Amino acid sequence: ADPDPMKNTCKLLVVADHRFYRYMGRGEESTTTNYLIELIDRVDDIYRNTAWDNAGFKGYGIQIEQIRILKSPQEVKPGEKHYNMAKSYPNEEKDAWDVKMLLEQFSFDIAEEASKVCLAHLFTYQDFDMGTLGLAYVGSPRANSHGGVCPKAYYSPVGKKNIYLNSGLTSTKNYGKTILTKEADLVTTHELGHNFGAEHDPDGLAECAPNEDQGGKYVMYPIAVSGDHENNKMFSQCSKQSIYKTIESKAQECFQERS
Ligand SMILES: CC#CCOc1ccc(S(=O)(=O)CCCS)cc1
Ligand SMILES: [Zn+2]
Ligand SMILES: [Zn+2]
Known part of the structure; x- marks a missing residue:
């Protein structure tokens, strides 16, 4: 039962849309890719060091299998939408999409690709x-759940095709600024934490949402x-129970060796 290493890695499709390309990668393929390679690796450090059952079930994490860099916005006809299109949806006045809407759109458009990997993730600005x-x-x-690690076919029928909900997204812009790289790390940690089976920490449970002098949240x-408190970049016991339940199962399903 001990961690069969041949299956300890969730492989990632990473997608940088044109926004991220323009404003984080400075319009360069190289600068864009290295940002994302370095980030996923740092996030992996946190996962792989986490002992999900507080025992031997550890050394699990993530690794990029494919990077997709969309250097320009997606051509689109009136009526049409696409997650990499130039205008925000729904409200085209805003800087950004409605986030639920965005994650849906991305899950539709990236369907074919997501089928091939444990998780697909959009990075946007x-x-x-x-x-x-x-x-x-x-x-x-749950044998029949939707969302998270491991592609599992679901028929929308908003889109009229199979989609996989093995997805999530990260934005490196917040309140008119580029967030610090130490903040991006945590956003993706947390978003991948949801994929890996974690819910938000309950505000009540003192143990999983400590005060500042306990090390913070x-x-x-x-x-x-904010990222500077001892606990900030770590998973609570709540998260570890939830994720262990998901992983113990889903790892056999689709986790792999490091490639
Ligand atoms: C810096 C940092 C950090 C920790 O990770 C997250 C905390 C809150 C959010 S949120 O505000 O979008 C609410 C959660 C939606 S998944 C998203 C990610
Ligand atoms: Zn914001
Ligand atoms: Zn969340």
């Missing part, structure tokens, strides 16, 4: 309302952590 940084579908052990706190 837009200023979602209310300090929203990203979103992702929560994974589950953990990474699955619903409100963004």
Whole structure:
């Protein structure tokens, strides 16, 4: 039962849309790719060091399998929408999409690709309302659940095709600024945390949402952590129970060796 290493890695499709390309990668393929390679690796460090059952079940994490860089916005006909299109939807006045809407759109458009990988993830640069940084579908052990690690076919029927909810997204813009790289790390940690099966930490449970002199909140706190408190970049026990339940199962399903 011990961690069969041949299956300890969730492989990622990483997608940078033209916004991220323009404003984070400075309109360069190289600068864009290296940002994302370095980020996923740093996030992997946190996952792989996490002992999900507080015992031997550790050394699990993520690794990029494919990077997609969309250097320009997606041509689109009136009526049409696409996650990489130049205008925000629904309200085209805003800097950004409605985030739920965005994650849906991306899940539609990237369907074919997502089928080939444990998770697909969009990195974008837009200023979602209310300090929203990203979103992702929560994974589950349940044989028939939708969302999270491991592609599992679902028929929409908003889109009229199979989609996989093994997805989530990260935005590196918040309240009119590029967020710090130490903040991006945590946004993606947390968004991938949802994929891996974690819910937000309950505000009540003192143990999984500690005070500042206890080390502060953990990474699955619903409100963004500032990042400097001891607990900020770590998973709470709540998160570990939820994720262990999902992983213990889903790992056999689609996790792989490091490639
Ligand atoms: C810096 C930092 C950090 C921790 O990770 C997140 C915290 C809150 C959000 S949010 O505000 O979009 C609410 C959660 C939606 S998934 C998204 C990610
Ligand atoms: Zn914002
Ligand atoms: Zn969340």
